[PDB]
Each structure stands twice: as C-alpha cells, then as structure tokens.
Amino acid sequence: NSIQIGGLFPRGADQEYSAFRVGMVQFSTSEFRLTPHIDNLEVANSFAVTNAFCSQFSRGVYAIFGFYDKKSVNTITSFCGTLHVSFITPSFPTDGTHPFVIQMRPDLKGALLSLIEYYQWDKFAYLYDSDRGLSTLQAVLDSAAEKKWQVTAINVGNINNDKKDETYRSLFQDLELKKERRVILDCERDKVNDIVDQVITIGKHVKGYHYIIANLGFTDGDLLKIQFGGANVSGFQIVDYDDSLVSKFIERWSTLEEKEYPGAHTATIKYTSALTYDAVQVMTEAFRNLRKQRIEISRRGNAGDCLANPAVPWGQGVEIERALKQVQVEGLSGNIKFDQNGKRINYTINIMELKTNGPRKIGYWSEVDKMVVT
Amino acid sequence: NSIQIGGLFPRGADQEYSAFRVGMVQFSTSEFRLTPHIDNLEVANSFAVTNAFCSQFSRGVYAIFGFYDKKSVNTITSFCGTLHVSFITPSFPTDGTHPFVIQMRPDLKGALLSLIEYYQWDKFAYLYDSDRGLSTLQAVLDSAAEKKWQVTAINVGNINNDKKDETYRSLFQDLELKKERRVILDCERDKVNDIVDQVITIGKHVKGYHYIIANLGFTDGDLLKIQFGGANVSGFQIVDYDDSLVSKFIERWSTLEEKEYPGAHTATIKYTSALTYDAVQVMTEAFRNLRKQRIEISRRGNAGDCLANPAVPWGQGVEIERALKQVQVEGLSGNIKFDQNGKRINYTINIMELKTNGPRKIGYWSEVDKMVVT
Amino acid sequence: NSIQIGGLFPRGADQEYSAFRVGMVQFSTSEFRLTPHIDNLEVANSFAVTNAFCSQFSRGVYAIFGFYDKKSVNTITSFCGTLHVSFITPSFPTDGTHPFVIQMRPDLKGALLSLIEYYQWDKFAYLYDSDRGLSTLQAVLDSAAEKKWQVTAINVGNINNDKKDETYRSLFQDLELKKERRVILDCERDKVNDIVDQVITIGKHVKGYHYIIANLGFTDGDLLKIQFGGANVSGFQIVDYDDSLVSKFIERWSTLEEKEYPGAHTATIKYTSALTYDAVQVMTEAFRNLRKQRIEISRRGNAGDCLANPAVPWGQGVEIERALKQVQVEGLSGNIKFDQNGKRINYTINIMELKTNGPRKIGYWSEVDKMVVT
Amino acid sequence: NSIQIGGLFPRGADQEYSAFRVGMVQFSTSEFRLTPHIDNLEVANSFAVTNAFCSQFSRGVYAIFGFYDKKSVNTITSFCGTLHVSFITPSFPTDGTHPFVIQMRPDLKGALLSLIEYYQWDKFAYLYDSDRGLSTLQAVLDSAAEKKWQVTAINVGNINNDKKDETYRSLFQDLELKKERRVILDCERDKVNDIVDQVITIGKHVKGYHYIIANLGFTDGDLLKIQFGGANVSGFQIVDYDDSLVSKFIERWSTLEEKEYPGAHTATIKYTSALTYDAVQVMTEAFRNLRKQRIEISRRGNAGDCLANPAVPWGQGVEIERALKQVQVEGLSGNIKFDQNGKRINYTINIMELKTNGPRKIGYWSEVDKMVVT
Ligand SMILES: *[C@@H]1O[C@H](CO)[C@@H](O[C@@H]2O[C@H](CO)[C@@H](O[C@@H]3O[C@H](CO)[C@@H](O)[C@H](O)[C@@H]3O)[C@H](O)[C@H]2NC(C)=O)[C@H](O)[C@H]1NC(C)=O
Ligand SMILES: *[C@@H]1O[C@H](CO)[C@@H](O[C@@H]2O[C@H](CO)[C@@H](O[C@@H]3O[C@H](CO)[C@@H](O)[C@H](O)[C@@H]3O)[C@H](O)[C@H]2NC(C)=O)[C@H](O)[C@H]1NC(C)=O
Ligand SMILES: *[C@@H]1O[C@H](CO)[C@@H](O[C@@H]2O[C@H](CO)[C@@H](O)[C@H](O)[C@H]2NC(C)=O)[C@H](O)[C@H]1NC(C)=O
Ligand SMILES: *[C@@H]1O[C@H](CO)[C@@H](O[C@@H]2O[C@H](CO)[C@@H](O)[C@H](O)[C@H]2NC(C)=O)[C@H](O)[C@H]1NC(C)=O
Ligand SMILES: *[C@@H]1O[C@H](CO)[C@@H](O)[C@H](O)[C@H]1NC(C)=O
C-alpha cells in the first residue's frame, strides 16, 4: 500500500525540502509509505503554480503539499476548493475560511496584540511588508481604533532598495523627532535582517528603542548584532528548544551532513522547516486513521484534467480532507489540532525578549488564555 | 479582415456588456470586424477565470477584454505575461508593473491626496472595503506618516448583508464619540449607497459634516437623497457630460431600447461602462494601426492549451502589445494615452462637489499638474 | 332574522373592508344574522354619497356604516337626522352635535392640548391639512389665545403631486428662519409620511427637534425612518397592541391572506379599520339588545323614496338610535361607550413616544383625568 | 323665448326676494321672459336643499339662483358639477374651482390684507365665525406667517346668547390683558351687531380701539351706534351710492312700498340684494346672447330625476355656463366680469372709514391694483 502525494517548493527552499525528506524517512510506516513528487518552481508565479497543480492532479494525488505566496494563495485555494484536493501548507493563513486547505502556521495577530497590550504601548510605528498578506495590518488598525492607539504604518515592500537608503534615514529621523521609539517589524526574515542591518548602520538602536519582530523565527534570524546594543528587542517563537521532541529531533538533525541534507548541519532550525516536519507527521497520522476506518479512498483511474469542464470532483478527496482536519498530535511546533476550516488551534507561542546574555523566554501565549508571564 | 477577441465579463455586468456592444457597433467599419467570444463568469473564482482564459486562448483569440478582482488579478497577470496575450480591462490598476496588461482606470491615489491637501485636513476617517484592494489605504497611510495626520481606518467589507444596519449605526456612533467630522468612503457604488442610506437614516448628513467618495463614479450613485442634507460632499468624475463627445454618445445611449440593451435608457453611464466603450475604441484603433503597418499577424489554431509544458508563446503578442500601448485617442474618459507599463497618462480627473442645485465641477486634476481650482 | 344594514367605503380603503368582513364573521350568528350592502364610491363626492345613501335607504336598510369627508359630512348628517337612519362611522367627529350619527373615533383635541401643556410649549408650528376639518386648528388657536402661545399655522393640503418637494423645502426653510424646532402634524398617514420623508431629506430629524403626530395612527405610519435620528417624536394611539383582545385579534388577523382579505396579513392595523371592527361589534350588540327587549322593527312595507316630500321618518329609527347609543362594550379601541350625542366617552388614548428601541408608551389620557404619566 | 329658472331662498329672506323681483321687472324684456319658481327653505338643511334642487331639475330648469352656507355649499357644487346645471349665487365663494357655479360676491381676503398693510398693523385680533367658511381665516394666517404678524384668532360662532354676556366680558378682558386695540370682526350681521352692542356696553368703543368689519356691507349694521367716540372703525363697501346707476335704482327702490315689496322703502340696500339684482341682469343678458347666437336649448319636464343611475348630464347646460362666465356688464356692484372658474375678475371694492359724523370713503381696491388713497 502507498499513497501518492504532491510536493511544491520554491526555487531556493533547500532546508524545507531537507526537513520534508527527514520527516518522510522518520515517520515512514512499513504498512504504507508516501510516494511524494517534488516540483521546484517560483511560488510567486501563479502560472507555474497552476501548472504544477494540474500536473499533480493529472498524476492522481490525494494530498498536495507545498507553499504559496501572496500572488498564488488565491489560485491555490480556488483550485483546491473546486477540485476537492486537500492542500497542506506552512505558509501564512488565508485571509478567511477556505475549504480543503490545512493552514499549519498559527495566527500571530492575537499574540502580537497581546504583547503590545502587555508592554502597554500607546503609540508606535508599524513597519509592514505585503508578503504574508495585510490581515495583520488590518487587525492592528482595528485594535488601534478600539484602544485609541497612535500607530503610523509604513510600507517597505514597494521601495526599491537602491533608492531606499535616504528614505530610511528620513523616516528614522521623523521617528526620532516624534519620539517614536517603539517600532514593529512585520516582514519576512530577509527583510527583517535588512532593516536591522540598516538600523545598526544608522545607529537607531539606542536605549529606548523597543523593536518587535512580528514573525515566529525570532532566533532563526540574526540576533547577535543587537545583543549588546542596549535596545529593547522582542519577538515570538513557535518552536521550543526545551521539550524532548524538539531536543531529540535537533540532535538527529545537527548530526546530519550538509552535502545530501542542505541546511541541516546546525542547531537553529526555521519554523517553516519545523512545520514541514509537523506536516509530514499529520499527513501520516491522517492517512493511518483513514486506513484504520476501513475506507479505501484509492481512485480507480486517473483524476483527469483540472481545466476539463464541467469540474471533476471526487468524494475521496472530501474524505481525505475530513481525515486531515481530525488529527491531534504532539510535534515540534507544539500541539497540533485543526478546526473544520483548516486553521490550527490549541497552540502555544513562546515569547522571548533579547538580553545581553541572549534571548530568553519571558512567557507564553495561547488562544484559550491571554499572554502569560513565565 | 476579421479579428477575434475574447470577453470575461462578470455575472451581473449588464451595462458594461451593453456599452461593449454599442462600441462594437459604432466603431465597426468595412476595414475589418471584431468578433468577440463573451463569457459570463464569477470574477472572484480563479478556477473559472483560468478556464475561460485558456478556453479563449485555445480559440486563438488575439486580445482579451474583461474584469478581475483582488482574488483573481494575479492569475490574469501571470497568464498574460507568460502566454504573451494582451488583456484590456477597466478594473482597478495592478499594484505595480505587469506586461501585456492594459489598464483603463486612471489612478486615484494622487487625486485623492491632492484633494485632501486642498481641503487642508488633519484628522479624518477612512472607510475602506477590503474586497477591492488597499492600495489607496496604503498611500494615504504613508502620506499621513509623512504629513502628521490622524487617519482612523475602518473596514466595512466583512459586514454581511443580513445585519448591515446596526453595524453602520454603531460604527458612526463610535466615530461621533471620537469626534470625527470628515469621512472618506473608498468603496464601490453599492457599498457607498448603503453607507449613505445609513448616514441619512441616522441623520448624519446635516451641516458640519464632510464626505469624500473615493471613486471615479461620483454622479453614478443616487446622490439626490443627500443633496439637500447640507453637508459637504466631494468626489471625482472621469467622464465629463459637458463634453461634445460624451453628449453625442449620450444622445444615442438614452434611446437604446433598454429591453434590448440593458441599463441604457438613461442619461447617466457608469465609468466602468464608459471605459468598456473606450476599450472597444482603443482595441479597434490599435488593430487598425497594426494592420496599416504592413505587419503579418496571421495566426491559426496552433495555440494549444494554457498549461502547455513547455509554454511557448506567440511572437505576435508583443507586437499587439506595442500597438495597443501606442494609442493616443479621445473618448468618454477624456484623452487616452498609455505608458510602457500599460497604465494611463496625460489624463484628467474632474473634482466635483455636491450643491443644492446639483453637482458642480470645481476643478480638474492631472499627473503632470496637481489639483487646479476653476 | 336577517338584519339589513348598509355599507359605504372609499375607492382605496380595502383594509377597512377586510376588517369589516373579519368582524362580520366573528359575530356572524348569535341569535340572528346581518345582511350588508357594500357600495364603493368617491367618499368626497357629495352627489355620489347622496346617490348611495338613497339607494341603500330604498333597499330598506336599518342602520348604515360608512365614511365621509369634510365635503360630504353635512349631507350624511342631514339625511340621517331627517330620515331617522343611524350612521355608525369611524371618520372624524362632526364639528358640533348631530342626531342619528354614531362617531366611533374619539376626540383628539383634549389629548393634544394636554400633551402640549405637559411638554410646556410656548412657541411651535402647526401643520394642518384641509382634509378632516379645521376643528382642531380652531381649538389650538383658542387655547393659544387663552394661554399666550405663538402658533405658526401652515396649510399643507393645497399642494399637487408636482412640486411637493419644493413646497415642503420652502416651508421648512421658513421654519428655520423663524427658528421653530417644535412641530405638530394634523395630517393623516400619507401626508405625515410625505412630510417625514421631506424632513429627513432636508436633515431636520436630528437632535434638537420635536414632532407630534396629531392622529390616533402613530405606529401605523412609517416610524422606522425617524427612529434613529435622535429627535423627539410623540403621538397618540388608540389600539393597545399589548392587550388581551388586541393580541388575540392580531393573532387571528395576521394569519389571513391578502388575496381574500386585502391588507390583512400584517402585525399592525389602522385605527380606521379597527374602529370598523368595533362598529360591527357595536351594531351586533345593539340588535341583540333589541331582540332581547322583544321589539319588532320589521317594516310594514317598502321604505319609500329617499327624497320624499314631505319626508316622513319611521318611528323605529329612534329606537335603533337609542340601542346604538346605549350599548357599552370592550374592543380594540378600548372601552366603547357613547353619550346622547353619539360621541365616545369613557375612552382612553395611549400617548406614545418614539425611542431608539421602538415606540414606547409613556402614558394615557382620559376625559375625566388629564394626561397621566407612567 | 320662454325660459324657466329656479330660486332658492332662506326662510326669512325678504329684501333679497324683493330685489329679485325688482330685477325681474326692470329686465323683463319683450323678447323673452324668465319665469322663476321660488323655493323658501332652511338653507342650513342639506336635505331640504337637495329636495328643492331635485324638484327644480325634475321640472327641467335651465338655470338656478339661490344662496347657501358652509353646511350646504358642497351639496350644491357637487350636484351642479354632476348634472351640468348652472348656479348663480351672491353667497361666499367656494375655496377652489367648482364648475357650473357663478359666485357674484367678490373675494375679500386680498382687500383685507391690503388694508391691514396700509394701516401698518403688526399685532391685532381676529374674531371670526364658522358660518361663512374659513378661507379668510386661512388667508389671514398665511399672510401673518409671511409678514411676521401676531394675530389672535378667536372663534365666537360657537357661543349662545344667554351666556354671551359673561363669555364676551371674559373675551374682552383677555383682549385687554394683551392690550388689543386693533380687532377684525369677520362675522355675520347679527353676530357683529351683538359684538358692537357688547363693545358699547363694556365701554371699549373709545378712541384708540380700532375695529374692522370684514364684510362688504358697511352701511347695513349700526354704523351710528359706535360712530360717536372717536374710535377707528373701518369697513368695506361694494356698493357706491354716489354712482348715477345706483342713485337711479335707489330712487325707485325707496318709492316702492313695503306691502308687496318687503324691505324696500329704505335708502340702504344690502349688498346681497345688490348682487341679486346683478344676478338677474347677468342671466337675462346671457339668455339674450344665447338667443342671438341662434341656439335652441328647449328643455321641459323630461330631465327625469337627480338620482338617476347613471346620472346623465344635459348638453347645452355647458353652453349656459359659457354664456354666464364669459360676459361683462355694469351693475350695482360695478364691473361684472367672470373667469373660467366663475369668480369676479375686474371688481372695484370701496373702502369706508367711520367717524362721529358717519361713514366716508377712503379709497378703492382692485385685483390688479393695491390700496389706493384719495
Ligand atoms: C524596555 O524594557 C524595560 C525592562 O524593564 C522596561 O522597563 C520597565 O517597563 C515597564 C513597562 O514596559 C514600565 O512600567 C511603566 O511605568 C510607567 C511609570 O513610569 C507607567 O506609567 C506605565 O503604565 C508602565 O506601568 C517600567 O517603568 C519600566 N522600568 C522599570 C524600572 O521597571 C522599559 O519600559 C522598556 N522600554 C523602554 C523604552 O525602555
Ligand atoms: C464645507 O465647505 C466650506 C467651504 O466654504 C468650508 O468652509 C471653510 O471653513 C474654514 C474654517 O476653518 C475656512 O478656513 C479659514 O480660512 C481663513 C482664510 O485662509 C483663515 O483665516 C481661517 O483661520 C480659517 O482657516 C475655509 O476658508 C472655508 N472654506 C472656504 C472655501 O472659504 C467648511 O469648513 C466645510 N465643512 C467641513 C465640515 O469641512
Ligand atoms: C425633546 O426631549 C427632551 C428630553 O425630554 C427635552 O429636554 C427637556 O426640556 C425641558 C423643557 O421642556 C427641560 O425642562 C428638561 O430639563 C430637558 N431635559 C430633559 C431630560 O427632560 C426637549 O425640550 C425636547 N424638545 C426638543 C426640541 O429637544
Ligand atoms: C386711528 O386713527 C388715528 C388718526 O387717524 C391714528 O393716529 C395716528 O396714526 C399714525 C399712523 O401711522 C401714527 O403714526 C400716529 O402715532 C397716530 N397718532 C395717535 C395719536 O394715535 C391711529 O394710529 C389709528 N389707530 C389707532 C389704533 O388708534
Ligand atoms: C495630452 O493630450 C492632449 C490632447 O490630445 C495633447 O494636446 C497633449 O499634447 C498631450 N500631452 C503630451 C505631453 O503629449
């Protein structure tokens, strides 16, 4: 027995594929082993995304895995919902409910707002980038209207990095003269590293400057540059480096080689790779459950073409989606459990603030409870 | 000759299709004829959009006309950029550069910011609809950050129609608590009509209030019910009914036997339908120029399917794009001129206010010259 | 044992006929039956009213039910008082005393004056209509003369359906010039609805104003429009919807169909039709009382001619009149009891105010007690 | 050359009948005679009015002359407008356009308001009655609202004569409490006589108190009872006794005995009787016009009854109306010219003021020209 699955990875995602492969070899069951097809492409390109999706659908896959960007989330969700093909992804949650999509990255708007309230902020600057959607920006603006916050939102995606050296100085001087020492960096890791590099270059990390990084990879990026800068630096993390599961996984990970497993000869892993490991775990758990329920979702023939009119759905896909959204498993990113929509629930987000000795967990955040200080 | 094009009209777009037929029957001549294949679909469904798009592509069409939405713009842009097939649309301009896309709606961020500066505002509210995009919201937020404004951004897109009566009342009660006198409505015609109805019901159209309708169709709405309220109302208009071309078009549009041409037997025309008429005009002009240039654009049924692997485009696409972007003609929207990215330049937006004797054009806005008061 | 009665209804008053039939079937048979002749006409045309009255009298009817207007009240009064034929009517009470006429509508002049005194008005406006007489206008003027008020009486009746908007806008502009915020509407349902639409259009339903609907049909109008404006809206109501009889009737009435009972599928009921129902009850009770007294009212022969000279009145008409004015029952309007002149006594008018949550009763008015607050 | 006309007169009208007979003998042309039938009846009884009208129509009359009051005007107007029978009346004009009715009494609201403005009045009192229509009161109130007047309107037509002492004493005490030295008496002859008697009794007829008699007959009342005292007393006059025609008529009028011509041997004639004489003149000359036009209008006892179903008119009656309403003559009232409605157009109202010596003309009022001074 073997279930065919599809894999989508961007051009430059080596650690994610390495983590997927280690997860496959780890939770591979002798009763049934997944046969994954891996397609490398430009995740921003919707044409390439739909090409790969239709190729996988023609191959007759039961659960598609892969990433999506701001420019392909719509087509991915639309094709999955119309064709009843389950999609598992560690990318940003969709801006609203979307069937047949398994969002494994927990929402961070709640944790970010709780951290702002805990720090008791009234006015700050929101440095955002349109790469993970503007849902966090909308949530911040709505909460600012509710709580009477003086938030100044500045976009950094549109400015070309060539000419974006004087505008950084201008807006930083504006913040300094307005005493806007509180900033939030809602950007991808590369953009966050670029922004903090410019911050150190311009010397805008003096005492009083409280930086908040709105991503789950706080330690995954570079923090040794502002370790002793005397600036309040905070962030969030979904993977805990203390529990036994992640400890043993990291041992088995750093004991690997960087030749056949790129991006695996270190101790610090990315939350995307950890969530891909967790996705392998949830996939094998749900397929095992479906097999144990005496349901053979195996399609007799090929699924056909995606474009073929009228749409060609299949109830085995709905069954696979139902099995996917009914799994409760412990993993690297914490407790894994989903709603009927596909979003992730029952999760804990560890909050840490950078100090001179290093980042240290100042507490944890969940959904059933507000921010907790540890 | 006979050149075949495509159509992606939405399901519920009748006036735009009527304007399309009117433009076809007017600009049609003995030189050549335009044979379109019109598909009525859900512009929000990317799967349906893809089906229609490469259905027309397999039909071997030369250019495509239609609409899109924030949930399907990326699919259209990627498909056109990859298959080199042009796409003329009256929908919102794409947030950035996209080749083989001709956008007929002029940008409104610059005109709106100029109008706000002319009115000398410092604390106002911005009611935006997430179902259409947030480019204008991003622009106004950046300007406020660079000009020290107090913008209260409130989303009115998630408001369902089952209880969209108390929601607006509570929203405006909160605005009154915040002492908000000036409001900017960045919504479509139906949404702004609902907001105006709620404003009138809760009696918030009295003297001392200001409203700015952030859309090109100022006179498209039922603006008569708020005309006698006594509150400042400002907006933008793209079609000048006092122009000879617009008057001559209306002279035939008002007597079009509405049963045959839906939404025609009236003196007002929505800016989307006006841009559809202008799109027919510009397509005819571009094809006439291309043929009169001694260029062979013969194409047979060799297009294949949109998901061909590898996807080889046709060489006539770039020449059609160049011919389409080199058109300088006059229409209902005014002067029509495109840049190297497909966006419109050398255009004029008429800023209007609402008075007790009807709307009046106080001035005009341009991209080379800022707001001008007459 | 069939008792012959008559019926006059206007061309457009169908809910009143529906309520008449509902009462006719509610008290169908106790010890006899009632046989009505229904005649529809223009109630404001005295010739048609006389023709119908003469035809019904020639048909040998015992009592007559029907409406009248300011230009047809005198004819009905004179014919009834000379031919000794009773006339039960829900129309406006006659400006004086008149025999053989039963006026079901309670007087509103006392309640209106008491409400004005309770609100402590000194300067206000009085929008009257030349539709139901100017008796209330004369009473208000006399009271103002005796209490040192400043009444601005304006007629809103002599306007056509071609410049109503302009006329009302000019009237309220003059009202603003005089700085009058307190307004009284002596109009009926349609006229007050038009005035409400116009005042909403000009934006004068906001806080700082006060309107009194001087008619018993407070909730019968469309008060949903001004319920959220923030201005006081008072009124009067004769049917008490949270009663026992009223609730039972509304349950039995909202279940009917508009196909067979026009205007009889709603949770509300106009006071005219309610008084029609109570008139049916009153006539049935009066004839049951006459049967209990064992008096033969059967005519010796044909009634004769309506315009007979000399006019000889049948003596049994006086007994019919006494039975009509002697009955005392409880219905929708409340305690129904008449005096020697046919007017209503021992009645109660429920004063209502239009709050945001809805029209809430604030007290009741009687003839032996002044306005009582609860 | 033999025409039947109908006559309606109140039970107690003598001078009007005498003037009717005077006009009949004075215009008894040898070409044709107008044989009248006189019906004496209580004009305030709509049934009696209808009976007489139906009898006259049944015998086939061509025109009807008579009077009415506020309780019998609608019956006459409706019956005339339905059966197409002309009706000449010196009574008060109807408050609108009523066909087939000739109103020889000129309106007085315009002259009254012109006199008020010429006397420079801002606050005064207006004592009226409900026995001659409320059109003058409505006009006074509308003009007061337009010109910022303070008018005290008090109705004195609802009181009896035994309680008149106390009622009028309280009324004049209230007038003194407002210091009302300027009053307008829009009442009938008996009412104004009682008013002036009570004024003399209280002693308020001293200089300073200004009285205006709002009727055309300022010689019929006790013009000498209140003449002494120096009090301003004004009034109107439609008859001019200095005119040659009026003097020649009254020269015979005085010589006529009282036996067969009641109320004739006097130097003063009521304006109602003057309008009766003018009515005889106008019907006679209109029938001369009809006879000279070569038109046969022969009617006899064949018109049937008034209550015929369906009520069919008789055609040449509209020709009677056209002859009546499209003519101009000279009479006691002056120039007699009617419009398409039936009201006078080119009347000249004279204005009289009272001193201790007696009445004296002040000026004249016309429809095209305002108050005139001499
Ligand atoms: C950077 O991190 C340090 C870590 O201690 C922060 O120090 C303390 O931060 C808290 C809250 O962030 C401050 O409490 C505040 O006190 C003021 C009264 O001065 C009160 O009005 C506020 O509502 C809030 O409770 C606390 O004062 C501050 N200092 C100490 C010694 O505890 C610091 O605030 C962080 N930010 C910056 C810009 O330094
Ligand atoms: C609705 O539109 C009217 C247009 O008349 C607005 O009136 C504006 O009121 C402001 C008051 O702040 C005026 O500004 C003043 O300008 C003078 C001269 O520069 C300056 O000395 C004052 O200190 C003040 O700044 C403004 O001139 C005036 N508009 C015009 C055209 O004169 C009204 O405010 C608008 N309503 C709302 C709610 O925005
Ligand atoms: C509308 O209603 C309010 C509240 O009842 C009125 O305000 C009151 O006015 C009276 C004078 O008549 C004062 O004595 C009270 O103090 C006021 N407040 C309250 C809470 O009663 C108001 O006058 C009414 N009319 C208008 C035009 O606003
Ligand atoms: C009554 O008549 C007298 C004289 O005809 C009026 O007396 C003067 O009228 C003028 C008119 O504008 C006033 O300016 C004077 O002040 C009046 N003088 C006096 C002593 O009264 C008088 O106004 C008329 N009306 C009344 C009510 O007396
Ligand atoms: C803009 O359009 C107008 C009208 O066609 C034209 O006269 C003008 O030259 C254009 N401007 C430029 C810069 O081409």
Author numbering:
A (entry chain A), B (entry chain B), C (entry chain D), D (entry chain C): 10 to 383
Please give sentences taken from the publication describing this entry.
AMPA glutamate receptors (AMPARs) are ion channel tetramers that mediate the majority of fast excitatory synaptic transmission. They are composed of four subunits (GluA1–GluA4); the GluA2 subunit dominates AMPAR function throughout the forebrain.
We next determined cryo-EM structures of the GluA2–TARPγ2 receptor under two different pH conditions in an apo state (in the absence of l-glutamate). We chose pH 8.0 to ensure strict alkaline conditions for our structural studies and note that the GluA2–TARPγ2 kinetics at pH 8.0 matched that at pH 7.4, used in the functional studies above. As already apparent in the two-dimensional (2D) class averages, the signal encompassing the NTD tier was diffuse at low pH but was well defined throughout the receptor at pH 8.0. This difference was clearly reflected in the three-dimensional (3D) maps; the NTD tier was compact at pH 8.0 with the two dimers associated through the BD interface (comparable to previous structures), while the BD interface was absent at pH 5.5 in most classes, resulting in highly heterogeneous NTD dimer conformations (for example). At pH 8.0, the BD chains were spaced apart by ~55 Å (center of mass (COM) distance) throughout the classes, while the BD distances ranged widely at pH 5.5; some NTD dimers adopted an upright conformation with a ruptured BD interface (class 31), while either one or both dimers bent toward the LBD tier in other classes (classes 19, 23 and 37), resulting in a range of COM distances between the BD chains (70–93 Å). The two-fold symmetric BD NTD interface is stapled together by cation–π interactions between R172 and F231 on either end that are unique to GluA2 and is stabilized in its center by van der Waals contacts and H-bonds, including those between the H208 side chain and the I203 main chain. Despite its relatively small size (400 Å solvent-accessible surface area), this GluA2-specific NTD interface largely maintains a compact conformation of the receptor in structural snapshots of the gating cycle. Taken together, our data imply a unique regulation of the predominant, GluA2-containing AMPARs. These are endowed with a pH-dependent conformational switch—a compact NTD (at neutral pH) and a ruptured NTD (at acidic pH)—that responds to presynaptic activity and thereby tunes postsynaptic transmission and plasticity.
